Every structure is written in C-alpha cells, then in structure tokens.
Motif scaffolding. Structure first.
Motif, mmCIF file in Angstrom:
data_model
loop_
_atom_site.group_PDB
_atom_site.id
_atom_site.type_symbol
_atom_site.label_atom_id
_atom_site.label_comp_id
_atom_site.label_asym_id
_atom_site.label_seq_id
_atom_site.Cartn_x
_atom_site.Cartn_y
_atom_site.Cartn_z
ATOM 1 N N UNK A 37 74.090 45.219 17.742
ATOM 2 C CA UNK A 37 73.874 45.577 16.272
ATOM 3 C C UNK A 37 74.439 44.422 15.771
ATOM 4 N N UNK A 38 74.054 44.533 13.961
ATOM 5 C CA UNK A 38 74.086 43.136 13.011
ATOM 6 C C UNK A 38 73.456 43.562 11.922
ATOM 7 N N UNK A 39 73.665 42.630 11.241
ATOM 8 C CA UNK A 39 73.602 43.372 9.518
ATOM 9 C C UNK A 39 72.666 42.054 9.121
ATOM 10 N N UNK A 40 71.979 42.504 8.544
ATOM 11 C CA UNK A 40 71.485 41.432 8.034
ATOM 12 C C UNK A 40 70.919 41.182 6.845
ATOM 13 N N UNK A 41 71.227 40.659 6.284
ATOM 14 C CA UNK A 41 72.056 40.482 4.550
ATOM 15 C C UNK A 41 70.479 40.008 3.721
ATOM 16 N N UNK A 42 70.060 40.877 3.069
ATOM 17 C CA UNK A 42 68.556 40.613 2.598
ATOM 18 C C UNK A 42 67.414 41.458 2.413
ATOM 19 N N UNK A 43 67.779 42.637 4.536
ATOM 20 C CA UNK A 43 66.730 43.864 5.210
ATOM 21 C C UNK A 43 68.027 44.721 4.386
ATOM 22 N N UNK A 44 69.185 44.759 5.298
ATOM 23 C CA UNK A 44 70.085 45.287 5.313
ATOM 24 C C UNK A 44 70.760 45.486 6.287
ATOM 25 N N UNK A 45 71.355 46.871 7.213
ATOM 26 C CA UNK A 45 71.394 46.660 9.063
ATOM 27 C C UNK A 45 70.088 46.802 9.766
ATOM 28 N N UNK A 46 70.340 45.807 10.920
ATOM 29 C CA UNK A 46 69.663 45.523 11.521
ATOM 30 C C UNK A 46 70.213 45.518 13.198
ATOM 31 N N UNK A 47 69.177 44.655 14.587
ATOM 32 C CA UNK A 47 70.158 45.364 15.170
ATOM 33 C C UNK A 47 69.601 43.574 15.854
ATOM 34 N N UNK A 48 70.246 43.291 17.060
ATOM 35 C CA UNK A 48 70.364 42.351 17.459
ATOM 36 C C UNK A 48 69.912 41.813 18.718
ATOM 37 N N UNK A 49 69.534 40.802 19.443
ATOM 38 C CA UNK A 49 69.079 40.050 20.149
ATOM 39 C C UNK A 49 69.237 39.070 21.196
ATOM 40 N N UNK A 50 68.828 38.726 22.017
ATOM 41 C CA UNK A 50 69.501 37.933 22.893
ATOM 42 C C UNK A 50 68.281 37.287 23.465
ATOM 43 N N UNK A 51 67.850 36.163 24.037
ATOM 44 C CA UNK A 51 66.385 35.556 24.812
ATOM 45 C C UNK A 51 65.557 36.916 24.972
ATOM 46 N N UNK A 52 65.212 36.928 24.109
ATOM 47 C CA UNK A 52 63.987 37.519 23.816
ATOM 48 C C UNK A 52 62.636 36.655 23.961
ATOM 49 N N UNK A 53 61.321 37.299 24.359
ATOM 50 C CA UNK A 53 60.646 36.228 24.361
ATOM 51 C C UNK A 53 60.135 35.688 23.488
ATOM 52 N N UNK A 54 58.811 34.913 23.179
ATOM 53 C CA UNK A 54 58.494 34.580 21.901
ATOM 54 C C UNK A 54 57.683 35.040 21.340
ATOM 55 N N UNK A 55 56.851 36.547 22.286
ATOM 56 C CA UNK A 55 56.359 36.969 21.913
ATOM 57 C C UNK A 55 56.381 38.478 21.401
ATOM 58 N N UNK A 56 57.743 38.338 21.259
ATOM 59 C CA UNK A 56 58.422 39.425 20.428
ATOM 60 C C UNK A 56 59.017 38.823 18.886
ATOM 61 N N UNK A 57 58.770 39.388 17.545
ATOM 62 C CA UNK A 57 58.884 38.654 16.187
ATOM 63 C C UNK A 57 59.769 39.879 16.253
ATOM 64 N N UNK A 58 60.404 38.963 15.241
ATOM 65 C CA UNK A 58 61.970 39.574 15.314
ATOM 66 C C UNK A 58 61.418 40.377 13.273
#
Length: 67
Positions: A37-58
C-alpha cells in the motif's frame, strides 16, 4: 523497471486495503513482484508496487485523476 506508487495510469492512484491482499494481487497481474500500500500525498491513499515494467504507468501529477 519502475518502483512507484501504483495507480491506474490516467494520473490516478488506486486505494489499498491495508495489507497485501487487494492491490498486491493487482500488482502481480500488472507485473510488479512486490506490491504494498502507500499514501501518495497530493492524491490520497494509493497502492505501491516494486519492479513494474516500463509499459506500466502509475501516479503522475500535473493533472489530477480522470478516467
């Protein structure tokens, strides 16, 4: 590969259920090999991922979420 807070790519965030269960599973199918999970202040509560390919957008900001 990317490590960032995961969203759906349209300058958004996801939201998490505190643990792995929801978006760690989503992380797997999007192709990140750990998901949290994560919180991305600016938006709100978010999720988090590690090692996503370059074709993913976040998280992006510059805009705000639209879909």
């Amino acid at each position: 590969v990317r490590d960032g807070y995961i969203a759906q790519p349209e300058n958004c965030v996801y939201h998490c259920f505190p643990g792995s269960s929801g978006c760690d599973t989503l992380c797997k199918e999007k192709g990140g090999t750990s998901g949290h999970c994560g919180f991305k202040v600016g938006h709100g509560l978010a999720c988090w991922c590690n090692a996503l390919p370059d074709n993913v957008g976040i998280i992006v900001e510059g805009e705000k979420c639209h879909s």
